[PDB]
């Protein structure tokens, strides 16, 4: 058999991948790149085999020929007798979150406010909110809608990166990897928690997972869910308990992609690797847990229960859904 070469985005992912590789007896090995688009290019060149991707990045990968292999499955809201690997995925809820104390703010008064996004080109952080804003404003000038933002991946001198903070030294401002303080779900929620931004575009799970003591991290350890509100598209504000009736969209779960001729081997290796290091895996927590990273969602989201098999050997457009693909392609007309 062949080794599977994973692609880690940035140095924190690379460290976790190197621990996985050592524990896997090198059944998995690691390549690393600075951004997710650069990892996609390593896999297209055949210099890496696979990585797990947000749906906006699956669109970029899929336009280049890479295919979905397995999907993240988090705990289901409804009981199921099916094994995690065979249980159907339920998308996650993209939401817009604000502070309750910011009393005037609704979906309809976001213009000229400060925003926090997971990264350009990601589903909840960017494609869903900016796609809705372009459409509602009738304007492609989404780079001028908010007064300042942190949108990792955007031009670092532009207003879309003005709120980004870089790393411990202030280097790498706005890079779309975990070195940027405000990257990703947890970084964009921290941008809101710290009142750097007025609004964060994340998913429902992020707000729950980083409030009320669910996270012990210093910036989160003291946050209370009741201090946050969701912005609904009808211009109302709701408690974060009401995400099923106050979301911007339902997103397809993050999933692993690879080149088509390595998909079967990547699939078999991952099913074995999660049997060892997955949630309740043979070797987790004693040796290594593939789906933990101290809340930092490195390689996989920390709320992943397993990687699940896909139904219907789907193409990337079947996996993302036609409606979402068309929304992305509509927004990408602006660029």
């Amino acid at each position: 058999y062949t080794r599977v070469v994973w692609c880690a985005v940035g140095p924190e992912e690379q460290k976790k991948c190197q621990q996985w590789s050592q524990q896997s007896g090198q059944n998995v090995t690691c390549a690393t790149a600075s951004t997710t688009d650069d990892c996609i290019v390593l896999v297209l060149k055949g210099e890496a085999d696979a990585l797990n991707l947000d749906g906006g990045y699956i669109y970029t990968a899929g336009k280049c020929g890479l295919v979905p292999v397995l999907a993240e499955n988090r705990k289901s809201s409804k009981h199921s007798s099916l094994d995690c690997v065979l249980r159907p995925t339920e998308g996650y809820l993209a939401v817009a979150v604000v502070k309750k104390a910011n009393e005037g703010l609704t979906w309809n008064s976001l213009k000229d406010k400060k925003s926090c996004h997971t990264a350009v080109d990601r589903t909840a952080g960017w494609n869903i909110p900016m796609g809705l804003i372009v459409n509602q404003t009738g304007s492609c000038a989404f780079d001028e809608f908010f007064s300042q933002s942190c949108a990792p991946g955007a031009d670092p001198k532009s207003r879309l990166c003005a709120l980004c903070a870089g790393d411990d030294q202030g280097l790498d401002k706005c890079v779309p990897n975990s070195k940027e303080k405000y990257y990703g779900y947890t970084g964009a929620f921290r941008c809101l928690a710290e009142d750097v931004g007025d609004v964060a575009f994340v998913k429902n799970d992020t707000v729950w997972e980083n409030t009320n003591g669910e996270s012990t991290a210093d910036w989160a350890k003291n946050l209370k869910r009741e201090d946050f509100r969701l912005l609904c598209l009808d211009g109302t504000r709701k408690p974060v308990t009401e995400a099923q009736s106050c979301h911007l969209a339902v997103a397809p779960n993050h999933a692993v992609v690879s080149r088509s001729d390595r998909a079967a081997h990547v699939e078999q290796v991952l099913l074995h690797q999660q049997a060892l290091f997955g949630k309740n895996g043979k070797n987790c927590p004693d040796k290594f847990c593939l789906f933990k990273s101290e809340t930092k969602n490195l390689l996989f989201n920390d709320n992943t229960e397993c990687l699940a098999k896909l139904g219907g050997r789907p193409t990337y457009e079947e996996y993302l859904g036609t409606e979402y693909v068309t929304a992305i392609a509509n927004l990408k007309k602006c660029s």
């Binding site: 688009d37 996609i40 290019v41 297209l44 970029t60 336009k63 280049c64 020929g65 392609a329 990408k332």
Partner: peptide, 6 residues
């Protein structure tokens, strides 16, 4: 309906 970005 476009192609690969890279």
């Amino acid at each position: 309906l476009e192609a690969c970005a890279f």
